[PDB]
Design a protein around this ligand. Sequence first.
Ligand SMILES: Nc1ncnc2c(CN3C[C@H](CSc4ccc(Cl)cc4)[C@@H](O)C3)c[nH]c12
Ligand SMILES: Nc1ncnc2c(CN3C[C@H](CSc4ccc(Cl)cc4)[C@@H](O)C3)c[nH]c12
Ligand SMILES: [Mg+2]
Ligand SMILES: [Mg+2]
Lengths: 230, 230
Amino acid sequence: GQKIGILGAMREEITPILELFGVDFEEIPLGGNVFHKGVYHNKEIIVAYSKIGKVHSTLTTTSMILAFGVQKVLFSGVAGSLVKDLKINDLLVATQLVQHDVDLSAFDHPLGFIPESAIFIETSGSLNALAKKIANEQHIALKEGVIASGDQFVHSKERKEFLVSEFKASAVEMEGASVAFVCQKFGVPCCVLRSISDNADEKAGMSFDEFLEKSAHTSAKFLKSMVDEL
Amino acid sequence: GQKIGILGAMREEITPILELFGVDFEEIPLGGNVFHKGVYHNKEIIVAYSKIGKVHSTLTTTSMILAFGVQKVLFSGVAGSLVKDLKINDLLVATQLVQHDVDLSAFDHPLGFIPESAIFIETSGSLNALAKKIANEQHIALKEGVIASGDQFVHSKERKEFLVSEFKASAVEMEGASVAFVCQKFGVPCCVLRSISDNADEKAGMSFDEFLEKSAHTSAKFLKSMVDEL
Ligand SMILES: Nc1ncnc2c(CN3C[C@H](CSc4ccc(Cl)cc4)[C@@H](O)C3)c[nH]c12
Ligand SMILES: Nc1ncnc2c(CN3C[C@H](CSc4ccc(Cl)cc4)[C@@H](O)C3)c[nH]c12
Ligand SMILES: [Mg+2]
Ligand SMILES: [Mg+2]
């Protein structure tokens, strides 16, 4: 089968991936990351956590593509909810992603826009449709929406309101847009899957600490169900 | 000699590099970038502009290392001044770089800090010392200081004051910390050289437009003088 890269940002997001897949992994260090290489259902899987934020995740995704030759990238992890219908533990796939902290307004560019790029980065319609079909068959809600990514943990009503008003984002995290961006630049199909850990508000830190483990597991289990169909 | 990667962020920052080196270049596309491969003074040189910002520059630096096998990376371009003694056209090398827009304060981390990383990223003491020796011999001032990098063009007194107070930064740009970070992760020596284009204040946009071409040339000419000693 096709070689699949599987990414999280934090070790906690990939621990359930390694456990749920349950196969033997070889650990390969490169560029400050540890890549776990295994075989699952006749497919090579490469699993890593990037470390937090846009630079870390850009580097790790580029390494996955250039050094390991992955043919698709599936990102699994947690996110903050920006919409009332995404509750703790709920899943979404990002149809589009934006770097919400990019600001070239001094040159009259829209927020999120960089010359020679675009505000919104697309993911794989095929992988997103597969996710939705699995969610429907398993009787779980799966939102499809915009994810905003930046290098700040969002924990205020004011910043939430900006993300909703400026980008119509449904969730916020720190890595999805960079992962999807790298994949687009190399022509590699990408899916970004997140489970809600908090509401990105004043109490988000406490909610994140409480729900990281469960939400990371919810996303990882769903990612595995996608790989089972690939 | 050793294979050298030479990076700018904007096409305008590498146009003088290609012209000043004056050799034949082969254009090689990869990952949305165009790499210009030439031979200069018995050294292979790979020149590219990354496009603006942290994600673009992280990707291009990773490609330079993984796909082209560069053994050192020299970054050349322009920057906004945060200190009175760095005037338009003046040069500095970054002794350390910080991602000034990283904010994990919700988890009680210092600004700029990411777990499993550090606030300040180091560059090559050898390359920085070479730069200083060349500047002294050529009778030009060369500051050695902290450069702050983020995904916003800085154009306000308030943000300048934050960068100086929080990080003691001397200049601000959008790519240096990410380039230096990637190089550190792969063990590749890095030097980040910038020429001042503006004062990062309310009028920075107009100053940048006026001085981009000259400042980019000043940095490129100095970078070439470093390569002449390598
Ligand atoms: N409200 C929010 N804002 C941004 N990102 C996230 C995420 C997703 N990721 C989790 C993780 C949050 S930053 C952090 C720092 C130190 C420590 Cl010890 C625990 C967490 C980042 O990889 C983004 C969940 N909620 C978020
Ligand atoms: N005050 C400042 N703040 C941040 N970065 C810089 C830089 C360095 N780079 C130049 C370039 C500024 S962003 C931009 C966008 C659209 C257009 Cl058409 C022209 C410029 C980025 O690669 C950062 C110089 N001054 C800066
Ligand atoms: Mg594409
Ligand atoms: Mg080192």
